[PDB]
Design a binder for this molecule. Structure first.
Ligand code: GTP
Ligand code: MG
Lengths: 10, 163, 13, 415, 142, 585, 570
């Protein structure tokens, strides 16, 4: 998928 | 519903007409470069009126508004004898287009305030309204800073919505 | 194929 | 002389690869898709790309780029005919050819690319015989793969004995916008559906002009076959001597002969189109469709595609007979008529708006291109005369035929 | 003075664009495609700056999503990468666990965040809570 | 009319671009038919879908008037999508966008401070050079206000109307008087942006704007000493976006002043030492500190510390910091010149590094670094590098060798040696603009020409398919062929030159298919010059010029015929017009 | 993962090792380096299954270059499976043996290949014939040391003609590789044997035993007639690679026939409808068919002179066929169909494929140069394109008007009076040079050439090489024609071309004109305002030393590129 991963993880 | 333009030259009082028919007062108005729109609701017909200013950098862009237009209001000035030549030139440059061909015309002899200002007949035979073809042209002398004749012109124009 | 055929002869020598 | 038959897809990942010589590296396929994107984004596209000293012959199917590299002075006609025969073999096993068949049938597609080609030289590609030792469900290979008759496994038995023909015309046309006809040629394709018992020897006999002239009947109705391209099955030496078409047929559907003749008679369907394109305002289409052909035959489902501008809007369609749908996916008004008899004249008047602010790029002028289909009606006048079933066993078979005219690229250039 | 911004994803497709200079719409499609082609053809220890044609072109990948800028050649360079980071913090504090999808679908609001942060080229709100408060109060106006 | 989420969810289901076009146009025609009904209800989502169709790269030219109808609306959602469509679909030159002028002028005096945010943002992002002459009187009224959300937008919109109309900044000078006193930082930051633009454009504003040096000095020191805040805090470093802009304003001030340079000395000396340098943010602040210190007539003890900062930046593994240090050293090449050359091995080592940007900045810094003392040694490194570039760095390096060697060459012999070296090894990467300057310098050279023409002739007997090489060589033969072949009016003992292979190599140049046909024009010019320069074998090149008179190139067909007239009619007036060309700077 | 795969691959039940090797060649499909599992799948090779041996042989075929020393653990299994009574498994073993390119292996594999070249069932012989060429590809002298060329040339002396087709294919593959020592051609009786084996092999074999005949050349007339009369009925085959190869051998063999007899005309009336009907094929084969028609109408133009109509493009051809049909339309344009070509090129310059539009206008140019009867019609067509005001069409049509006025300089003075009013904002420096030349050469019927060149004189120092040099020629030509109204113009262009101009060819031409004009301006009318001799056109008919060999390569990469077969292979 590679899209559902959030960007900067807070 | 009836889509309306108010094209014409600069200093013709067209924004004064547009805020006298909608609101009802003579609001102090800048020379409007772009356009205005106020849904006049008169003779139970919502006259959408696309007031378009008439400075020299805008007059090419009137062709963007000539589509689904069910009738013009070509406001001329009665106090500009020097500009009725280019008023005729604009009115004969504009009414001969294929877009906006079924559009009735309602010419206003606006700014009746001086003996320099003309009546309907001299503006008619300087603009040359008797040389039009397929036109429901109808000059109507209006006074924008008193409201005199405007609602009568819209009354005529509301007669000519349906056939 | 919705259409219909036509028989052609066999020998025709 | 192929080197490595690949199967790409629309992104550049290899669904299946199978090298035959090892004279091209296997990681040369990763250099394909950037070269195709580079050559297409400057308009110098060609089927033969070039990565240094490795040439990429390729065809483009639905999702697939069947790239087949080579390195030497490769025989390009051989490579491209092999690529379309790979397409035909896959589409005769797998009833569509997409990515969803190559990633599911790697059991059989590696066996097929093992079988079809050896070292770059295609050797067994008739699919109806290839269904007998390469299956998705192995014995000895048949004697059909050996013998001279290499398209017909012996011992086929049916209860009935039916030979279905299809003398399917295809009128081409390209009418220039002045009103005259430029290229009006007819590409027929006698497309059989054979169901016989044994190893028969058919002798198809047309009304060929050279046969009627060598016989002495050169004053009756005779079609003038300019060029005839037969299947493999037709023995061509006997055709070249005295115009006799003798062939041992396969089992199933195939294209027997593909003739092509010109025609200096009027077009069948004629499309007189006008355009009232006012700039910035609107456009009108007073297009009339007069059916020049005979009064007896009925043009089933014509679809006169008519190219509208790209950004037209809010349409109106006053026709006489037949529905109009405006298809904006293609920017055309597909004026459909279901039953279009010969001799009539049905008139249509489209009417669009047009955006007042002008476009940014020019668009081009595609042709009006009809999609007609007139059954029981051969334009060129070809008449099948007989079909001599000859079998050592000896039986009465039932030949059949039907006649269809279609469109080829029945285009008409516009204003 | 940031010339433009190009949120484009990993496969090459463009998810956002905001041109603070007015070059014609053929040059937008040629500049955008050649810059997506330069940045996606670059390795990962490659200093996050490209001297692209009098524009010190910045990029800082965050996911499959890339980012991009073009700072003019007299300004600071690291702070433009930090502007990219503050814009990702705004896209996160508005959404809440910002994604690739929620920039695809809510791009109408992605421009409104970018227009509550960068107008005309420069930064307007150096804080990060006044910006999200202003956009959530302009959306609480509904 | 489907929503935008439904549209983008459909476009994600499209596989081929040739089918994604079908799914765009399928809905784009429904948008076009929903614009001719003059909808007021569903026009928000139609312009939102049309902006999405624009962003994918499609025609969206028609939905500009239906943005202008959204802008003059009364709802806020319609205005919001309308100003987004105005900022995306319109520019300076779309020419329908003069119609936004009255709409923005009516929405700058709107009651809501969120509609005026849109009307300032659109005018800032895409106002043109004629909108601003009708809008600057109403932007500066929004600049005199007391509302902080409009001060920061009016300052940047004033930046835009000064950038597009640069003869208009004089009516913001009585606007920015005494507004460095804002409690807010966003207003403070955008007013510093306005001061940066006002000081960048015209030095008639500097003497008024270097009076407010100590005010923002106190502002920056109170930014540094207020070490913590909930907002503005990036990584524990207090308000970087304001510190960088204040340091940039201090860079563009005092760059030729002495009083303000001693005024801004204190906070620069403090921020050069007392900043956290761990994260990216402190490198940003301190890099701007270094660029501030380098350009002002500073303290002598500052720049020692600044060179020490750059020495700390050059050695980091973080490639961002190397790009920063190389850009900083590229900035201060001339200013504090002798402190830069002591990082020479560090700069040269970056040419071996595996980045595009690092090699390019090390290249440009090396080309700027060469003075008249390291010229002999560093050129061997550069001419190894010219051998060892990418195919995109050979051009810039090959131009830089010529630009460097014209400046600070120790000799004229070695200078032609390295130029000839580059032309023999670069070839198809040196620009064709180099040839007039190369020919200009070798004809400025008045003393060494046989050493030139022999090496040119020995270098083009090898190859011809490198175009600027034969470009230089043909002119060198044509104007100095009296020293190539010496005294050989008839045959002598065999010397390397033979006055027939000299003409046969030009004959091979003319008929080779690897020529741009300006090398061919050089070649015919050299052939006709070799009727006067050679007395040995003439009336044989006459055959070549006569048979080249019916070639298909237009200028060559002129040139051969207009020479053949002189070879057939005016044989004593041929030499009367082939004197050497004069020499210029 | 792969270890559990090896655990399933070292099992005793067949239905786990079978799924193991299917999983292995599915991992090979998706692009995994499964090369480390090589000597553990080869234990699962000697199986009773045949649907499984194909997969293991496939794995051996892909992964022997990368595991070359490991690959010596299959040779006994190849020579073990080359004895089995099933012919399919023998031919599978034989076509696997050749594909493994490992130099430790092919030394061992000549013995079962020698066994199989004389084997009975002709499926394994038609495999082993091509496997001989597979063996000669790897190690050359090992084959002749084993002596397979004699066993290969005896397969041609056998019946069952698919064997003959594969043997001739591999024999041509061998004979191409040698330095032509012991050339492998034969007598005409073997050619009678192949030509009677041509009407019986497959649709693919008829290509290979017509690539054999592209090397032979006969020595008589009746001999060449007897082999052309049996290759000629291959012109009625649907497979568009058989037709083009028969055209290859017919175009080779018609260099030997007699023009006086009736077989030359009968042959060229049988060779035009197949070359026309190749264009009713699929659009990747139209590219090869059109480059070979481009290479035939340069050699024998007697064939396709009557067919212009089938070379008119459609709209929905791709760009690589629309580019080549314009080239064929150039090659066939004569006095009979100037009107169809010009009315067809005027409808092609209304496209948006800019490569194709520029090619159509240059085709108007080459068609105007080719026929002198219709250049009036061509210049009227070009002016009717220029009066539409589309920028790239005008920037090509000005170049074409230049390339006509240099060729036909006599009576086209009533055209430039339209061309003096062309709105000189024209931008591309290929067209600015053409306009400056047309102004300069014809500066008598342009009665105000003096006022329009001044707009070209504002930015003289930075335009290009060509526009500056053409201005220097044209203004000097104008001053030499009329010295009255351009006296200060030639002085200002000399002080702009010799003082502040650094271009050395510009300085050379400037000082030559300055010294010519200050020396003897009356002689200059004989010097530069000369009658220029008649222009030898760029003959794009390829050299018939090369073209005689490119006929032998028709339907290969040597004819699509129009190159010899040595300047592009490596
Ligand atoms: N005496 C008199 N003056 C008028 C009248 N209408 C307009 N004016 C004057 O004309 C000037 C221009 O009127 P506006 O309507 O405000 O501007 P405009 O005519 O719309 O000019 P544009 O917007 O560019 O078309 C105003 O300053 C008024 O003083 C009128 O009815 N009577
Ligand atoms: Mg007004």
């Amino acid at each position: 998928k590679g899209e559902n991963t959030s960007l900067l993880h807070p | 519903e009836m889509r309306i333009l108010m094209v014409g030259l600069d200093a013709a009082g067209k924004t004064t007409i547009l805020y006298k028919l909608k609101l009802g007062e003579i609001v102090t108005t800048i020379p409007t470069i772009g356009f205005n729109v106020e849904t006049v609701e008169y003779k139970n017909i919502s006259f959408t009126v696309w007031d378009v200013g008439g400075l020299d950098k805008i007059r090419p862009l009137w062709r963007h508004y000539f589509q689904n237009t069910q009738g013009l209001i070509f406001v001329v000035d009665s106090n500009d004898r020097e500009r009725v030549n280019e008023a005729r030139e604009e009115l004969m440059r504009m009414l001969a287009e294929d877009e906006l061909r079924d559009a009735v015309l309602l010419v206003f002899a606006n700014k009746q305030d001086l003996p320099n200002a003309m009546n309907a007949a001299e503006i008619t035979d300087k603009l040359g309204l008797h040389s039009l073809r397929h036109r429901n042209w109808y000059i109507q002398a209006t006074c924008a800073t008193s409201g005199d004749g405007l609602y009568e012109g819209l009354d005529w124009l509301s007669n000519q919505l349906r056939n | 194929t919705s259409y219909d055929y036509c028989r052609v002869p066999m020998e025709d020598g | 002389s192929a080197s490595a038959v690949y199967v790409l897809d629309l992104k550049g990942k290899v669904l299946i690869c199978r090298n035959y010589r090892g004279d091209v590296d296997m990681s040369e396929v990763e250099h394909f898709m950037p070269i195709l994107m580079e050559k297409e984004e400057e308009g110098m596209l060609s089927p033969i790309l070039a990565h240094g000293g490795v040439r990429f012959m390729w065809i483009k199917h639905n999702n697939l780029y069947l790239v087949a590299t080579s390195k030497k002075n490769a025989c390009v006609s051989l490579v491209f005919s092999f690529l379309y025969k790979v397409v035909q073999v896959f589409s005769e096993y797998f009833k569509e050819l997409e990515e969803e068949s190559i990633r599911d049938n790697f059991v059989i597609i590696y066996e097929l690319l093992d079988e079809l080609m050896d070292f770059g030289y295609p050797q067994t590609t008739d699919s109806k015989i290839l269904q007998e030792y390469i299956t998705q469900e192995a014995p000895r290979p048949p004697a059909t793969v050996t013998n001279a008759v290499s398209w017909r496994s012996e011992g086929i038995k049916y209860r009935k004995n039916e030979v279905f023909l299809d003398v399917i015309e295809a009128v081409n046309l390209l009418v220039s916008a002045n009103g005259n006809v430029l290229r009006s040629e007819i590409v027929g394709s006698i497309k059989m559906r054979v169901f016989l018992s044994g190893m028969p020897e058919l002798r198809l006999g047309l009304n060929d002009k050279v046969l009627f002239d060598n016989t002495g009947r050169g004053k009756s109705k005779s079609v003038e076959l300019e060029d005839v391209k037969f299947h493999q099955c037709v023995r061509l030496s006997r055709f070249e001597n005295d115009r006799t078409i003798s062939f041992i047929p396969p089992d199933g559907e195939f294209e027997l002969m593909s003739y092509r003749l010109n025609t200096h008679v009027k077009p069948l369907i004629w499309i007189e189109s006008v355009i009232e394109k006012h700039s910035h305002s609107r456009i009108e289409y007073m297009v009339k469709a007069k059916s020049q052909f005979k009064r007896r035959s009925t043009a089933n489902n014509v679809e006169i595609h008519i190219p509208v501008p790209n950004d037209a809007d809010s349409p109106k369609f006053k026709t006489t007979v037949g529905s109009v749908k405006w298809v904006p996916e293609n920017s055309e008004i597909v004026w459909s008529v279901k039953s279009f008899p010969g001799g009539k004249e049905y008139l249509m008047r489209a009417h669009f708006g047009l955006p007042s602010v002008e476009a940014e790029d020019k668009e081009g002028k595609p042709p009006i291109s009809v999609k007609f289909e007139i059954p029981y009606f051969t334009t060129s006048g070809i008449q099948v005369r007989y079909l001599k079933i000859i079998e050592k066993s000896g039986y009465q078979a039932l030949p059949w035929v039907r006649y269809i005219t279609q469109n080829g690229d029945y285009q008409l250039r516009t204003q | 003075m940031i010339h433009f911004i190009l949120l484009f994803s990993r496969q090459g497709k463009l998810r956002l664009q905001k041109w603070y200079i007015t070059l014609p719409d053929k040059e937008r499609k040629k500049i955008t495609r050649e810059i997506v082609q330069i940045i996606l053809s670059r390795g990962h220890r490659t200093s996050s700056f490209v001297d692209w044609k009098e524009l010190k072109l910045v990029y800082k990948r965050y996911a499959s999503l890339y980012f991009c800028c073009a700072i003019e050649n007299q300004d600071n360079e690291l702070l433009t990468l930090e502007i990219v980071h503050r814009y990702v913090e705004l896209l996160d504090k508005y959404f809440g666990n910002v994604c690739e999808l929620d920039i695809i679908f809510n791009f109408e609001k992605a421009y409104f965040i970018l227009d509550e942060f960068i107008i005309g080229g420069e930064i307007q709100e150096t804080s990060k809570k006044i910006a999200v408060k202003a956009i959530e109060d302009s959306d609480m106006l509904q | 009319p489907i929503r935008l989420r439904e549209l983008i969810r459909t476009i994600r289901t499209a596989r081929t671009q040739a089918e994604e076009r079908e799914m765009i146009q399928k809905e784009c025609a429904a948008i076009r038919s929903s614009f001719r009904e003059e909808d007021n209800t569903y026009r928000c989502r139609n312009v939102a879908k049309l902006l999405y169709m624009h962003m994918l790269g499609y025609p969206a030219h028609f939905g500009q008037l239906e943005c202008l109808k959204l802008i003059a609306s009364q709802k806020f959602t319609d205005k919001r999508i309308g100003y987004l469509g105005a900022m995306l679909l319109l520019d300076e030159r779309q020419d329908v966008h003069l119609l936004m002028t009255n709409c923005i002028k009516n929405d700058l005096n709107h009651s809501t401070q969120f509609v005026q945010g849109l009307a300032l943002c659109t005018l800032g992002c895409m106002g043109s050079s004629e909108m601003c002459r009708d809008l600057a009187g109403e932007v500066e009224k929004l600049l005199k206000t007391s509302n902080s959300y409009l001060r920061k937008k009016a300052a940047l919109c004033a930046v835009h109307v000064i950038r597009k109309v640069p003869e208009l900044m004089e009516m913001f000078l009585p606007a920015t008087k005494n507004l460095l006193n804002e409690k807010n930082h966003g207003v403070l930051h955008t007013s510093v942006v306005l001061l940066t633009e006002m000081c960048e454009r015209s030095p008639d504003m500097l003497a008024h704007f270097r009076k407010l040096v100590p005010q923002l000095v106190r502002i920056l020191k109170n930014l540094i000493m207020s070490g913590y805040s909930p907002e503005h805090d990036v990584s524990g470093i207090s308000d970087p976006f304001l510190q960088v802009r204040i340091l940039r304003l201090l860079r563009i001030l005092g760059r030729n002043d002495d009083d303000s340079s001693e005024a801004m000395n204190d906070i620069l000396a403090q921020v050069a030492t007392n900043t956290e340098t761990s994260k990216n943010v402190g490198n940003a602040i301190l890099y701007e500190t270094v660029l501030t210190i380098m350009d002002i007539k500073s303290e002598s003890g500052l720049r020692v510390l600044a060179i020490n900062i750059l020495g700390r930046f050059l050695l980091n593994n973080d490639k961002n910091i190397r790009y920063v240090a190389l850009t900083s050293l590229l900035k201060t090449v001339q200013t504090d010149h002798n402190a830069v050359q002591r990082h020479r091995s560090t700069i040269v080592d970056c040419l071996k590094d595996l980045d595009v940007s690092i090699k390019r900045r090390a290249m440009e810094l090396s080309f700027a670094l060469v003075n008249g003392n390291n010229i002999r040694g560093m050129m061997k490194e550069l001419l190894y590098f010219l051998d060892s570039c990418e195919p995109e760095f050979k051009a810039d390096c090959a131009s830089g060798i010529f630009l460097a060697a014209e400046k600070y060459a120790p000799s004229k012999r070695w200078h032609i040696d390295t130029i000839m070296r580059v032309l023999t090894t670069a070839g198809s990467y040196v620009r064709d603009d180099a040839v007039p300057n190369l020919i200009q310098l070798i004809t400025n050279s008045v003393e060494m020409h046989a050493y030139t023409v022999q090496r040119l002739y020995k270098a083009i007997l090898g190859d011809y398919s490198q175009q600027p090489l034969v470009q230089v060589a043909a002119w060198c033969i044509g104007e100095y062929g009296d020293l190539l072949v010496s005294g050989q009016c008839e045959e002598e003992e065999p010397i390397q030159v033979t006055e027939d292979e000299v003409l046969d190599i030009l004959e091979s140049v003319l008929i080779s298919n690897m020529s741009t046909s300006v090398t061919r024009g050089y070649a015919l010019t050299a052939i006709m010059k070799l009727s006067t320069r050679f007395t040995c074998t003439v009336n044989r090149i006459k055959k070549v010029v006569s048979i080249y008179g019916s070639s298909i190139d237009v200028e060559l067909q002129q040139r051969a015929v207009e020479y053949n007239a002189l070879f057939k009619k005016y044989d004593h007036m041929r030499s009367a017009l082939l004197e050497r060309m004069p020499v210029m700077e | 993962e792969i270890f559990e795969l090896k655990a399933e691959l070292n099992s005793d039940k067949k239905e786990k090792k079978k799924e193991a090797v299917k999983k292995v060649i599915a991992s090979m499909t998706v692009g995994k380096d499964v090369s480390a599992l090589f000597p553990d799948v080869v234990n699962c090779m000697q199986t009773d299954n045949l649907e499984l041996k194909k997969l293991v042989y496939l794995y051996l075929m892909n992964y022997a270059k990368s595991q070359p020393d490991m690959a010596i653990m299959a040779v006994n299994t190849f020579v073990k499976d080359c004895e089995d009574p099933n012919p399919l498994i023998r031919a599978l073993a034989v076509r696997t043996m050749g594909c493994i390119r490992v130099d430790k292996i092919t030394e061992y594999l000549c013995e079962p290949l020698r066994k199989c070249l004389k084997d009975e069932d002709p499926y394994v012989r038609k495999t082993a014939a091509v496997c001989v060429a597979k063996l000669h590809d790897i190690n050359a002298q090992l084959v002749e040391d084993q002596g397979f060329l004699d066993t290969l040339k005896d397969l041609i002396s056998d019946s069952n003609p698919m064997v003959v087709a594969n043997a001739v294919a591999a024999l041509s593959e061998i004979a191409e590789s040698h330095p032509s020592s012991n050339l492998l051609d034969l007598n005409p009786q073997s050619i009678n044997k192949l030509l009677t084996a041509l009407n019986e092999c497959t649709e693919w074999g008829q290509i290979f035993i017509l690539d054999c005949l592209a090397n032979y050349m006969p020595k008589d007339d009746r001999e060449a007639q007897s082999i052309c009369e049996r290759v000629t009925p291959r012109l009625s085959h649907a497979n568009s690679a058989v037709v083009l190869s028969a055209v290859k051998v017919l175009m080779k063999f018609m260099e030997m026939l007699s023009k006086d007899l009736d077989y030359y005309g009968t042959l060229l009336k049988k060779l035009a409808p197949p070359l026309v009907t190749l264009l009713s094929a699929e659009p990747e084969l139209q590219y090869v068919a059109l480059r070979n028609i481009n290479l035939i109408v340069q050699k024998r133009p007697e064939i396709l002179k009557h067919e212009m109509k089938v070379f008119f493009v459609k709209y929905n051809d791709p760009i690589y066929v629309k580019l080549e049909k314009l080239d064929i339309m150039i090659r066939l344009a004569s006095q009979a169909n100037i009107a169809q070509v010009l009315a067809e090129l005027r409808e092609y310059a209304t496209e948006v494929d800019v490569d194709f539009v520029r090619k159509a206008v240059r085709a108007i140019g080459r068609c105007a140069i080719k026929v002198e009867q219709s250049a009036e019609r061509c210049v009227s067509t070009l002016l009717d394109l220029i009066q539409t005001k589309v920028n790239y069409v005008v920037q090509e049509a000005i170049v074409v008007i230049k390339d006509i006025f240099r060729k036909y300089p006599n009576k086209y003075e009533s055209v430039i009076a339209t061309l003096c009013e062309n709105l000189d904002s024209l931008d591309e420096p290929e067209a600015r040079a053409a306009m400056i030349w047309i102004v300069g050469e014809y500066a008598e019927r342009i009665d105000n050439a003096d006022e329009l060149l001044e707009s070209f004189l504002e930015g003289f120092h930075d335009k290009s090489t060509q526009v500056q040099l053409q201005l220097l020629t044209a203004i000097v030509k104008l001053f030499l024609k009329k010295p009255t109204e351009t006296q200060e113009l030639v002085q200002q262009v000399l002080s702009l071309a010799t003082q502040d101009s650094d271009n050395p060819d510009l300085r050379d031409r400037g000082y030559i004109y300055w010294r010519l004009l200050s020396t003897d301006p009356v002689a200059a009318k004989e010097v530069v305002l000369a009658e220029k001799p008649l222009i030898s056109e760029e003959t794009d008919l390829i050299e018939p030393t090369l073209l005689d060999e490119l006929i032998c390569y028709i339907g290969t990469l040597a004819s699509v590129y129009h190159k010899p077969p040595s300047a592009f292979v490596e």
